[PDB]
Design an enzyme around this catalytic site. Sequence first.
Site, PDB file in Angstrom:
ATOM      1  N   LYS A  38       0.830  -1.197   0.000  1.00 25.13           N
ATOM      2  CA  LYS A  38       0.000   0.000   0.000  1.00 25.13           C
ATOM      3  C   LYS A  38       0.874   1.260   0.000  1.00 25.13           C
ATOM      4  O   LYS A  38       1.149   1.852   1.059  1.00 25.13           O
ATOM      5  CB  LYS A  38      -0.952  -0.014   1.197  1.00 25.13           C
ATOM      6  CG  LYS A  38      -1.814   1.234   1.343  1.00 25.13           C
ATOM      7  CD  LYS A  38      -2.919   1.285   0.317  1.00 25.13           C
ATOM      8  CE  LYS A  38      -3.957   2.331   0.698  1.00 25.13           C
ATOM      9  NZ  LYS A  38      -5.116   2.334  -0.231  1.00 25.13           N
ATOM     10  N   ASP A  50      -4.992  -0.007   5.382  1.00 23.70           N
ATOM     11  CA  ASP A  50      -5.360  -1.097   4.497  1.00 23.70           C
ATOM     12  C   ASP A  50      -4.364  -2.244   4.578  1.00 23.70           C
ATOM     13  O   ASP A  50      -4.755  -3.409   4.408  1.00 23.70           O
ATOM     14  CB  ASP A  50      -5.518  -0.558   3.077  1.00 23.70           C
ATOM     15  CG  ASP A  50      -6.791   0.237   2.925  1.00 23.70           C
ATOM     16  OD1 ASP A  50      -7.738  -0.039   3.696  1.00 23.70           O
ATOM     17  OD2 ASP A  50      -6.854   1.134   2.063  1.00 23.70           O
ATOM     18  N   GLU A 109      -2.310  -2.304  -3.980  1.00 21.03           N
ATOM     19  CA  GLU A 109      -3.528  -1.506  -3.862  1.00 21.03           C
ATOM     20  C   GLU A 109      -3.178  -0.022  -3.887  1.00 21.03           C
ATOM     21  O   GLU A 109      -2.397   0.444  -3.052  1.00 21.03           O
ATOM     22  CB  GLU A 109      -4.288  -1.833  -2.576  1.00 21.03           C
ATOM     23  CG  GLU A 109      -5.402  -0.811  -2.251  1.00 21.03           C
ATOM     24  CD  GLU A 109      -6.196  -1.167  -1.016  1.00 21.03           C
ATOM     25  OE1 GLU A 109      -7.063  -0.358  -0.618  1.00 21.03           O
ATOM     26  OE2 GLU A 109      -5.961  -2.250  -0.437  1.00 21.03           O
ATOM     27  N   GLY A 145     -24.804   2.499 -12.505  1.00 21.00           N
ATOM     28  CA  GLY A 145     -23.687   3.362 -12.821  1.00 21.00           C
ATOM     29  C   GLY A 145     -22.367   2.650 -12.999  1.00 21.00           C
ATOM     30  O   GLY A 145     -21.388   3.292 -13.413  1.00 21.00           O
ATOM     31  N   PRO A 198     -18.814 -12.149  -1.863  1.00 20.91           N
ATOM     32  CA  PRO A 198     -20.087 -11.949  -1.166  1.00 20.91           C
ATOM     33  C   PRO A 198     -20.008 -10.814  -0.161  1.00 20.91           C
ATOM     34  O   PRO A 198     -19.043 -10.696   0.600  1.00 20.91           O
ATOM     35  CB  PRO A 198     -20.315 -13.290  -0.467  1.00 20.91           C
ATOM     36  CG  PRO A 198     -18.940 -13.807  -0.273  1.00 20.91           C
ATOM     37  CD  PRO A 198     -18.217 -13.448  -1.532  1.00 20.91           C
ATOM     38  N   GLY A 200     -20.174  -8.134   2.780  1.00 19.18           N
ATOM     39  CA  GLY A 200     -19.880  -8.240   4.196  1.00 19.18           C
ATOM     40  C   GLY A 200     -18.790  -9.217   4.567  1.00 19.18           C
ATOM     41  O   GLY A 200     -18.642  -9.541   5.750  1.00 19.18           O
TER      42      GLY A 200
HETATM   43  N1  DCP Z   1     -16.982  -8.401  -0.254  1.00 19.65           N
HETATM   44  C1  DCP Z   1     -16.865  -7.240   0.606  1.00 19.65           C
HETATM   45  C2  DCP Z   1     -16.432  -5.917   0.078  1.00 19.65           C
HETATM   46  C3  DCP Z   1     -16.320  -4.736   0.992  1.00 19.65           C
HETATM   47  N2  DCP Z   1     -16.611  -4.899   2.412  1.00 19.65           N
HETATM   48  C4  DCP Z   1     -16.593  -3.795   3.345  1.00 19.65           C
HETATM   49  C5  DCP Z   1     -15.185  -3.379   4.030  1.00 19.65           C
HETATM   50  C6  DCP Z   1     -15.109  -2.077   3.950  1.00 19.65           C
HETATM   51  O1  DCP Z   1     -15.540  -1.433   5.242  1.00 19.65           O
HETATM   52  C7  DCP Z   1     -16.075  -1.620   2.829  1.00 19.65           C
HETATM   53  C8  DCP Z   1     -15.439  -1.370   1.583  1.00 19.65           C
HETATM   54  O2  DCP Z   1     -14.415  -2.286   1.308  1.00 19.65           O
HETATM   55  P1  DCP Z   1     -12.873  -1.773   1.047  1.00 19.65           P
HETATM   56  O3  DCP Z   1     -12.390  -0.839   2.134  1.00 19.65           O
HETATM   57  O4  DCP Z   1     -11.991  -2.979   0.933  1.00 19.65           O
HETATM   58  O5  DCP Z   1     -12.847  -0.963  -0.351  1.00 19.65           O
HETATM   59  P2  DCP Z   1     -11.665   0.100  -0.728  1.00 19.65           P
HETATM   60  O6  DCP Z   1     -10.299  -0.482  -0.428  1.00 19.65           O
HETATM   61  O7  DCP Z   1     -11.741   0.323  -2.216  1.00 19.65           O
HETATM   62  O8  DCP Z   1     -11.845   1.537   0.052  1.00 19.65           O
HETATM   63  P3  DCP Z   1     -10.717   2.614  -0.392  1.00 19.65           P
HETATM   64  O9  DCP Z   1     -10.911   2.770  -1.885  1.00 19.65           O
HETATM   65  O10 DCP Z   1     -10.815   3.958   0.293  1.00 19.65           O
HETATM   66  O11 DCP Z   1      -9.346   2.014  -0.162  1.00 19.65           O
HETATM   67  O12 DCP Z   1     -17.067  -2.777   2.690  1.00 19.65           O
HETATM   68  C9  DCP Z   1     -17.072  -6.229   2.913  1.00 19.65           C
HETATM   69  O13 DCP Z   1     -17.329  -6.356   4.059  1.00 19.65           O
HETATM   70  N3  DCP Z   1     -17.177  -7.390   2.000  1.00 19.65           N
HETATM   71 MG    MG Z   2      -8.578   0.144   0.789  1.00 15.36          MG
END
Ligand code: DCP
Ligand code: MG
EC number: 6.3.3.3
Lengths: 227, 226
Positions: A38, A50, A109, A145, A198, A200
């Site tokens: 990261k 992250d 990422e 979207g 899936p 959550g």
């Molecule tokens: N299959 C999934 C996908 C997402 N989440 C949850 C965790 C996070 O609280 C939120 C969004 O996921 P991420 O943080 O992983 O997404 P990003 O990394 O893209 O957020 P950012 O872009 O700011 O890094 O939903 C989840 O529980 N199950």
């Molecule tokens: Mg993230």
Amino acid sequence: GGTILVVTGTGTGVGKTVVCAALASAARQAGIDVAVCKPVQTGTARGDDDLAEVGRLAGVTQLAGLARYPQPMAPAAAAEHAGMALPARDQIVRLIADLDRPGRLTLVEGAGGLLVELAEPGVTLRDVAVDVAAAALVVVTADLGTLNHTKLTLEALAAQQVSCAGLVIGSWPDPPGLVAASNRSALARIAMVRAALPAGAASLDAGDFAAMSAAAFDRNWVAGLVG
Amino acid sequence: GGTILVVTGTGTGVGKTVVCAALASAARQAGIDVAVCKPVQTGTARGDDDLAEVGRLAGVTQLAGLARYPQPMAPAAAAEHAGMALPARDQIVRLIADLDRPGRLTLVEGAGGLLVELAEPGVTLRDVAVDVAAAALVVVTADLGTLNHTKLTLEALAAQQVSCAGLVIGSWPDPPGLVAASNRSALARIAMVRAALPAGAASLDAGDFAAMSAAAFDRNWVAGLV
Ligand SMILES: Nc1ccn([C@H]2C[C@H](O)[C@@H](COP(=O)(O)OP(=O)(O)OP(=O)(O)O)O2)c(=O)n1
Ligand SMILES: [Mg+2]
Ligand SMILES: Nc1ccn([C@H]2C[C@H](O)[C@@H](COP(=O)(O)OP(=O)(O)OP(=O)(O)O)O2)c(=O)n1
Ligand SMILES: [Mg+2]
């Protein structure tokens, strides 16, 4: 060296980290060494981390960071607020490069969407993918979207000839509503859909998340990623 | 001919429709004759009608459109569900071109963002914009993410050499907040910001919406469109 995948998204919030973690998990269950990286991490004063979350969910110990900014903003805004600077382009490439190693899958990422500025000036994850010869895996949603946003993202990956590893549906609702199912079919026409995580899954425990993760991806795609 | 802008967005729900109205309202008060085309409309079951909203808010009467699908999906899905093909590319282009006359500002509004399929087979708002030699007004949001999304779209556009006549922030929040205030500045670093419309303006009646819209744009730029 080995394989590098930048893990990108159609926007912020779309599930990038869970995908990094899921694919890293699935790869480790294939005996494949995984590092996750990261390079730019914002919003640390809100406890965002992250790298820690991929470890927390997948058990990856090879976690590599560089810049951290407190405010949850665009990295240029978060830097400018803290009085800090963005990394140079070569720092982000050097960070990935030392991680790179034959037999190893390094996931990278970025900070939000593909064209978010990561390094001065205007250097984005897409420039970084060119530099390390990485294919990009694009994380998508099923919500309205998403087809536009994805198409825009792939058109952007093509302008610099950055191969598309394919898409992962970040959050797959159960049950899927009419919009969600349609888009799932429509995106499968736009690119190889690698998995649909899936919803959550960030609340599944170690074993659950790993079972989910081994299920999400095609074994032969994963094992084919590193030779 | 006259001036044709397409009014696209970095996504859905960003305020495409009320920007069409506010720009139309501003042109009319500049003595310009305005027409708004919206070729495809989905979500008509629950009463979606972007053209009626432009008429109520800006008083446009030249309000043209070609299909209406009940489902609130993206056109081609809404069509697939109804059992009925999208309009053809020719229908859309020629409707838009017959609208065009000298002295008129013809606003075209799509459906969602730039790359959504609008007609068979796979022809987008962007295609249309090429064929009618229109520029794009990009409607944007102010939230975290506006930046990646604005940049994607401006690229997409320039790829097919569709000029960018600028950005409008669909909805400005009150009070702004750290993200919004920062992004309003970052957005101006990638393109001209012609307006930011106050959140909630769709709910105005036409007298109040007119006054809002007059103030929201630079008068010189408005008149310079036609
Ligand atoms: N299959 C999934 C996908 C997402 N989440 C949850 C965790 C996070 O609280 C939120 C969004 O996921 P991420 O943080 O992983 O997404 P990003 O990394 O893209 O957020 P950012 O872009 O700011 O890094 O939903 C989840 O529980 N199950
Ligand atoms: Mg993230
Ligand atoms: N200054 C503003 C901008 C937007 N809206 C509201 C009206 C709508 O309830 C919602 C969505 O706005 P639009 O219909 O204008 O957004 P779009 O046209 O882009 O949505 P769509 O893409 O579905 O047509 O935002 C508002 O009240 N005040
Ligand atoms: Mg609209």
